[model samples]
Target: DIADLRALLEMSVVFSDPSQPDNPMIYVSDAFLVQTGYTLEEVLGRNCRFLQGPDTNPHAVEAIRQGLKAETRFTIDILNYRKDGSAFVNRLRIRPIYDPEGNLMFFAGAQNPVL
Candidate 1:
């Protein structure tokens, strides 16, 4: 529902882990579901890249991947699609989180809707 997506947009950002390529999680408030048309269950353990489609921005995706490979945090705005194939501009900020042992744990991001 729209409410869920709104909540996600409001609360937090989204990101992916280079190590856990399959576990793409979005950390946001209840509004996330509203913006992306995904429930918490469906969003977890999945790559946010799945939101990319034929019209999505490949350059942004590649740039993100490269940044991860370099072990650096980067930010960019990319075009992403929804479950229904609707496109939106995502202002994404990505950073790597480290554990006490200095090992990377997760990639965290915050996304804002843009025109």
Candidate 2:
């Protein structure tokens, strides 16, 4: 499974249930916890937008909003904040997953820190 592989890898990965209100996070990898300094409980059921801070670019957020509205895969580099209020450039790639019946399942995202 893709999630299984992502869990094993030392990269940040997250999954959100699109069918849920606000597209709450359903899963997050260990690396994601390490990168964001958030426990599973703090992240689950919350939108990833919680990582956004005052300095985050509005244009990048708007682009992600548009892409999600279109249900399309997109990549963006945005400023994200960690639990300790530290900012980092997060290079995020998001993909939509559909069931065999072509129903939208969820969105999976991979994040890498950009120095």
Candidate 3:
């Protein structure tokens, strides 16, 4: 990842719209700050993919990208890295949310605690 991308991961929670790839949001979480070694100001408006590094699963990443493009919801167990470059197994969930009109508005998911 580039320096800007690395900087973004430190500042916010990265999320995306399942139906519209263009729609995305970043939420700054206290846990995000603690876990990712980033300050709240640095992570907004970026995807979690920036947190990934050499240890991350390529197939899992590709699967997520594919699922988003296909408008599908799924979960996967993959390796993820923290801002400090430490790696661990991550259970990531991706669910699609829709508005009253049934238009896909966003995708919501969380990285479950590693056992």
Best by lDDT: 2
RMSD of each: 5.7, 3.0, 7.6
What are the models' TM-scores? Answer: 0.78, 0.90, 0.73
Model 1, 1-115: lDDT tens digits are: 2334323223456645556546566354456567888778888677777767887667778888788767776888888777788998888787777769998866777777796
lDDT tens digits by residue: candidate 3, 13-87: 344544434445444446656877777666656666766789677888889888776777787888877788887
Candidate 1 off by > 4 Å: 1-9, 15-18, 21-23, 26-28
- Scored by CA lDDT, what does every candidate get? 0.70, 0.89, 0.65
**Which residue pairs does candidate 3 place in steric collision?**
11-42, 11-43, 12-43
Off by over 4 Å in 2: 1-9
In candidate 2, which residue pairs get closer than 3 Å at backbone N, Cα or C atoms, i.e. clash? none
For 1-115, candidate 2 gives per-residue lDDT tens digits of: 3455344226788888889999998889899999899898899999999999999999999999899989988999999999999999999999888889999988889999998
| TM-score (C-alpha, index-matched) for candidate 1 | 0.78
Model 2 collision count: 0
Candidate 3 regions exceeding 4 Å error are: 1-14, 18-23
Determine which window of 10 residues in candidate 1 has minimal summed lDDT.
1-10
Give the C-alpha lDDT of model 2. Answer: 0.89
